[PDB]
Paper text:
By hydrolyzing SAH to adenosine (Ado) and L-homocysteine (Hcy), the enzyme SAHase (SAH hydrolase) serves as an important regulator of SAM-dependent methylation through the control of the SAM:SAH ratio, and is an indicator of the biological methylation activity of the cell. SAHases are usually active as homotetramers. The protomer has a three-domain fold, with two prominent domains, the substrate- and cofactor-binding domains, separated by a deep crevice. A small C-terminal dimerization domain locks two subunits into a homodimer by quaternary complementation of the cofactor binding site, where a tightly but non-covalently bound nicotinamide adenine dinucleotide (NAD+) is found in its oxidized form.
The Zn2+ cation was incorporated into recombinant PaSAHase during expression and co-purifies with the enzyme. Co-purification of Zn2+ with PaSAHase indicates that the enzyme has a very high affinity for this cation. Specifically, our kinetics studies based on PaSAHase inactivation revealed that a tightly bound Zn2+ cation acts as a very strong noncompetitive inhibitor with an inhibitory constant Ki as low as 15 nM. Furthermore, the enzymatic study indicated that Zn2+ locks the enzyme-ligand complex in the closed conformation. Our crystal structures help to elucidate this puzzling behavior by showing that there is a tetrahedral zinc binding site, formed by three highly conserved amino acid residues involving S (Cys85), N (His323), and two O (Asp139) ligand atoms, located in the active site, where - together with the H323-F324 molecular gate - the divalent cation shuts access to the active site of the enzyme. Moreover, the Zn2+ cation is located at the interface between the two principal domains and is coordinated by three ligands from the substrate-binding domain (C85 Sγ, D139 O and D139 Oδ1) and one ligand from the cofactor-binding domain (H323 Nε1), thus further stabilizing the SAHaseclosed-Ligand-K+ complex. On the other hand, the potent inhibitory effect of Zn2+ is based on binding at the molecular gate and arresting the enzyme in the closed conformation.
Author numbering:
A (entry chain B), B (entry chain A), D (entry chain C): 10 to 469
C (entry chain D): 9 to 469
Write the structure that this text describes.
């Protein structure tokens, strides 16, 4: 019996070739393999994992396994799996349920296949999640499983928000580590990852020249910062929208004009509030917010003909694709690339000029239309994931008495010392040489020679 | 009015012309003037101020005065005063003791003139400092004055470190606000300020082409980040040194090669530990650390002939200028520009090829050889200073009983809401338009429509 | 009824046609020529042998030539550069095309032969459109009687032009040519900005490597090397540049690059001792951009850092000594057009060996081999020039001229600056750009007509 | 020695210090000194020179003198002289008539002092010019002097246009070399020089932050290209205007929005044709064209309040400053910085908000408000000048028989081989290493191993 489901198992050899390359690009993660090999700190760990089934995730999975864990895996997005990576993991004997181009029903089924082994709840004791979907399903549908789970390690900004809401409401059942907010995650992956992979995805989907054209990036947090750079470095004229004036100040100082889709920044919900002159000149819009309906129906109506629309935030509801499905006709160009014809719902003229190009049906475009962030960037994120798994598994929350569990429910980050140790391995991967403080210098600035080098207030 | 000392009072009209321009470049600060003029929240405040006597400081001073304060002012660096600014402030009837090109004895005398009025301690009740020199003098020499002081507002990273050391040792006598760590200060002034003003100062001092040449920036905190950009945007080939691997990871991802002056980063004090091949190719070295002896004697010996050496950190001991004074002959090119001849102490050949060019005798180069950060950047820093002064003055720490002082004796930052309000005014100064969240969107991400928009953990 | 073609898979035609319809919207200069000249049919009677990368962009070029009255027979000028959906869409429109991605060399030559011959005999060709000179060479060496009836050659690329100029110098060029490459809207658009767009694109598609923070060496700093260096630097690479031309090297220095040679003091003595092994041992990526031979040589390949990526974006694969690598080292295909080359020996390799290089597109032009080459909106410039060049030579009717008049016209020329400007204006309008009109006084002041041309022929832009 | 006029001879020692530094930054020029010292190829040359009396020109002058020439010198702009450079040249016994801040009458008088020695025409036999003013004066007022002059070497685009017009009309009396169109001049000086010195000048004059603000650059030739980069690299949002669609295409591809000051690009001279919405958002306008009235009266009226206006083309008539003198009130901020009050001609309110800031009264801003291009860039231009002087002086046009003069009366550029030799010295100055072709490679591409490497048609 094959305890997996993937698109095509014959892609395994290709995937394995790419894993071998990726190992060479992931020194922090491979360093953890070597360092913790002897101890087997994840011996006895049974990890439910839900995160984009890419080559990078493959190296993460095999690191967890190399440190003693067993896992059962699914992707956290319908379009993000690399089928060769899924195949290589399945062929190594690891249960994985993932393919590129899942339906929503298949997506839920894949998560269910990780949770259930041979038709009963798996004896899971750890969770690794990216976006909170697996966390939500366990809490909603398998609450008894959480009695035996020691913790959740959550990858992404959106997932963390959802955890913090559960904690505030008293509905979170196990502790978590916010992996996102290690500096080697948030200020590496979220920013430089998107810098690498946004323009990549747009080129693969459309092959559009970007230089000389007008872009609007909605948001200027870590993803928006990286996204804006991805485009500006290509020669786009990028405008930035924000609701956060500090982030907007950064965009101004970084050389971007800060604009709103709405007249005076006020959305009244009508077309009259749209800055039609602005949107009529935009060739590309990218959403980066983790919020809802930031590229709304009225904005879509006002966009320049033939504009590209995409989202690089975690969930597709940043863009009102439901409005587009209800009202406009979709013409598939190729997979994950649709022309959306604004002439009506029922059919289209093949030579119509009044369309938008939507990438990945509004799902995470970097992963949907390309391969997401590169190995050398994901090295940081995933070294943090491994450290976080070790920490929570060692803490054994599920074995605490009921009264003490109540006291130990938290959402925490990894210590700065570990964040530094990850960064050092990343730096060495580039051939970088960090200088060691003399004793006198360390005394002068008030730190130990080995670090940590900054107070916890430091923002980098 | 005679209660001042400046280089040349006849420069006042020029200074006033420049203050009128700077007011138009400082909307956050001017907005505070207009908003608080009626209420006079600083009525009764008597502020000892020690910060670079520039045009920008002039607008700060006159804002404090417009809100009801009286001040006595000095510069916190011997080369940083703009004499026209000092003159304009003196001519407005405000006690100021500052000029460009002070001796160290004059520097101390100027601070003493703020502390003493007519030969006796002034009835000061507030302190505004940049670097901690005034704060140190008050604690060491005028402890009775601190009994009646409500707080200190400290501008810069180095000054904050000194406060935090005092707090750790139980020697801090009054509460402080860390103005540096507002995002609209640290991630504006320290970074973009240096981006603007480093290349500016080097051009004014040397008129050297930077494009195509090799630079080494020591440090990659906010100043090193801004400094590196200042140089790279001019076409320099910039290498970065760091002791902090997180900051080094950022430098790598930002497109810099990370190097150490020392073989394997080990600074053992020996000549042989210097990477002679590296230093022999460097045309410019810039120190940005806030630490001691980061451009040391052995590094200076190994630098390429005709290299420029400068420091943009707060204090001159980043570079071992004492070694250069003791051993090498100094030839003044023009004010704040010296050729340092490595051939010997006693005289030099006017056509010697083996020299370095030192800017501002190792003191902060942006202020020493140019005019420091631009008005529109200092607007952020100084709007924070004003808000910080208001907050501590209203809290009236000096008048609290002993038991209540114990609860308030701390080093704090301004609330994020105020940091955002400053940023908004900066954004509007650029013509930027921030978007207003809908109530549904604000609920979705868990914030009020008016902000604050981020949790206190957020790093931007 | 139409069968006069050979492509990978005709069922890709609908996809290709969807992409052509998008590309038309990205190519205003080319589409402007279609609309302007449709009525007049200036290429009526033209029979064009075409040899250029069978991409979507070439598809729009082909259909423009056809829309203006031409008939064509087409092949690609590179074994890896065809987009199969584009080839299919062209075949389905009834146009003879012989092209697919992943040709062998024998197939490549056969495809060119299929354009030249129709039903086993020389086609009644009267025009040539070429990219690199291979078709031009075959006609001159093997089909001289066909050249008697050919009015001209329009040549796309720097390499091809060099070959034409050599023929002209030797008195062996049989028909006139237009150097399309040296329109400013080609050379300083396509060769530079095209590579800026498509180099990093190809490297990402092939390897998915992070480029930021890593060390690159770009060999050459002409238009391709300039664009290539920018492609990498804009991604955060630390880029070093090599050049033999000191003017181009001066530009690289001023542009913010360190200028280095693979050889100690720039002198190759042919031995491994002349290699700067310390330099090459730190390089993660090398890119050749020269149009020259063996600029990434065997000794350089031996000295490169383990796991370095090697690629070429010049016209021909001999920039890199891949023959040395085939003879001496073991090739492991990662996926199509991506090979690990194991430096441990010829016969087999360890799957976990660390001492390999990654070669893209077997050393053939990487932007077209591992991605889709330049974007439509850039190729618009190049291809509007191709169309204008075809119109000009076809109208001149060189083949029909008497001997004495042929002597006067047998040359390699560029398009007039006025036309180069007209192409540029349509490109600018495509971006929504608004050019200012000179007043009469201003035009007089600088000595030009209000409509242009705006610069003397000496101007370098 | 009294045969000079400069602002202040006591600045000579400072000038000499700066010349000694500049020599180290000018390897091509110093290489020419060493190479040609023995031959003294300019022995007997008597050169009238008219070009910006900067430190860089000082090194040029002393190179000509070191190769045997005698000279008489003036500046080609009223604001471009560096008084320390003029002083150092006078103190070396060389006739120079130049100071910063000349009136137009003084400017003409200075040129006349070069032409006349001891009250009568000097026995000049060579001319070095920058802009054509000296050339025009010789042709119009001293035609008899041209009978004994062997040639003109002309530095700049505007000067060359004027020569080519003279040649076309049959009014040019001596041959010329177009120094501008060496690649090591035009594509070095005109572009990278302005990149270095435009932002420099704006900072020195105003100390304005540039990041985040809106600029409009009129022109995108070599100067406009370099100017646009100067601003964009600082984080300005730069828009570009052009009449040349090829240059406009380059601006688009380089990442700029191309706009016209006039609606649809049509300049009918009416206020109605101005794009007031566009100009109302511009904080900085820079003219780069070498044309007339490209920043016209109606544009000046429509500019955003407090916009900076400047010109970096050769002559001040790019901007309609005559209109501003006739209609608006000028308030000097400091030398070469004026607020132009749009409220009327006769007086102004010191606190008026409706003004523009004009730099250098519309004269070349880089030289007027800073020091022009850096030594290492001018090295290229001036090595070309020296080679051009050698070539024409050795040809001895004035002494040629009539039939041979006819053949040599032309405006020519230097051979590409020499352009390459200059570039090589510049590259070596950066520590750059050029590769030598193998014999097989040289054969393959059809060039000699030593060069020239490109055909004359090549545009770089
Ligand atoms: N695609 C990827 O590979 C990838 C990588 C990292 C994170 N993410 C996801 O991207 C999203 C953003 O993450 P982040 O770390 O940048 O978060 P963040 O909190 O740093 O930034 C989001 C920004 O959006 C802004 N914003 C919110 N509503 C807005 C509106 N209506 N208009 C304009 N701006 C608005 C906020 O002010 C904030 O600055 C999340 O969903 C996260 O999980 C995706
Ligand atoms: N000149 C200006 O206008 C200006 C502006 C703002 C702040 N400052 C001053 O600049 C200094 C730096 O401030 P900051 O905000 O960047 O502080 P920071 O803590 O953000 O950055 C300093 C960096 O230096 C690094 N460092 C320390 N010792 C080092 C060594 N031996 N080698 C290499 N790197 C080393 C640290 O790791 C740290 O990242 C302080 O003195 C501050 O007061 C100057
Ligand atoms: N891949 C593409 O899409 C594409 C696009 C346009 C042109 N091209 C091709 O790229 C090649 C280059 O074209 P180009 O327009 O840049 O030509 P170019 O003449 O402008 O530039 C080539 C440069 O290579 C330099 N060079 C030569 N030998 C060298 C060596 N041994 N080491 C270092 N530098 C050396 C030359 O000095 C020259 O500056 C040609 O083969 C051309 O056909 C490819
Ligand atoms: N300040 C300096 O140090 C310096 C340096 C080099 C040259 N220059 C001078 O700068 C000027 C420009 O020189 P260049 O080499 O760039 O010349 P150029 O011919 O390369 O460029 C000038 C550009 O202006 C454009 N133009 C003309 N009229 C225009 C209009 N009405 N609106 C918009 N664009 C218009 C032209 O199309 C052209 O592209 C000349 O006067 C030259 O002598 C000054
Ligand atoms: N123009 C300026 N006026 C006043 N302070 C300045 C200026 N430029 C930089 N600074 C300050 O210098 C400090 C370093 O001592 C920084 O914290 C910064 O706030
Ligand atoms: K990837
Ligand atoms: K300033
Ligand atoms: K393409
Ligand atoms: K200068
Ligand atoms: Zn996820
Ligand atoms: Zn200070
Ligand atoms: Zn070709
Ligand atoms: Zn001049």
């Amino acid at each position: 019996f094959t305890d997996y489901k993937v698109a095509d198992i014959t892609l395994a050899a290709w995937g394995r070739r790419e894993l071998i390359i990726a190992e060479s690009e992931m020194p922090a993660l491979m360093g953890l393999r070597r360092k913790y090999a002897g101890q087997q700190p994840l011996k006895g760990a049974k990890i439910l994992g839900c995160i984009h089934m890419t080559i990078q995730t493959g190296v993460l999975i095999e690191t967890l396994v190399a440190l003693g864990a067993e896992v059962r895996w699914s992707s956290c997005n319908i379009f993000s799996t690399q089928d060769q990576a899924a195949a290589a993991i399945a062929a190594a004997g690891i249960p994985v349920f993932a393919w590129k181009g899942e339906t929503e029903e298949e997506y839920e089924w894949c998560i269910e296949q990780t949770i259930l082994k041979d038709g009963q709840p798996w004896d899971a004791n750890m969770v690794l999640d990216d976006g909170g979907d697996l966390t939500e399903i366990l809490h909603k549908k398998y609450p008894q499983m959480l009695e035996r789970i020691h913790g959740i390690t959550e990858e992404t900004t959106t997932g963390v928000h959802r955890l913090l809401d559960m904690l505030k409401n008293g509905t979170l059942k196990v502790p978590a580590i916010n992996v996102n907010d290690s500096v080697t995650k948030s200020k590496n992956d979220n920013k430089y990852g998107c810098r690498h992979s946004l323009n990549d995805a747009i080129k693969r989907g459309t092959d559009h020249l970007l230089s000389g054209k007008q872009a609007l990036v909605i948001g200027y947090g870590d993803v928006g910062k990286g996204s804006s750079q991805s485009l500006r470095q290509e020669g786009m004229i990028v405008k930035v929208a924000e609701v956060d004036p500090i982030c907007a100040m950064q965009a101004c100082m970084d050389g971007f004009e800060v604009v709103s889709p709405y007249k005076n920044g006020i959305n009244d919900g009508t077309e009259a509030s749209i800055d039609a002159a602005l949107l009529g000149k935009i060739d590309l819009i990218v959403t980066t917010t983790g919020n809802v309906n930031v590229c709304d129906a009225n904005m879509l109506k006002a966009l320049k003909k033939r504009a590209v629309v995409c989202n690089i935030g975690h969930f597709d509801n940043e863009i009102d694709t439901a409005f587009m499905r209800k009202n406009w006709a979709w013409e598939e160009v190729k997979p994950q690339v649709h022309k959306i014809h604004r002439t009506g719902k029922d059919g289209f003229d093949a030579h119509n000029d009044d369309y938008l190009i939507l990438l990945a049906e509004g799902r995470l475009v970097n992963l949907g239309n390309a391969t997401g962030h590169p190995s050398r960037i994901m090295d940081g994120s995933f070294a943090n994931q491994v450290l976080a798994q070790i920490h929570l598994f060692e803490q054994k929350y599920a074995d605490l008495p009921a009264a003490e569990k109540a006291k130990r429910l938290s959402v925490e980050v990894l210590p700065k010392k570990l964040d530094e140790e990850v960064a050092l391995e990343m730096v060495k991967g580039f051939g970088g040489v960090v200088t060691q403080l003399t004793p006198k210098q360390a005394e002068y600035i008030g730190v130990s020679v080995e670090g940590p080098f900054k107070p916890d207030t430091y923002r980098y």
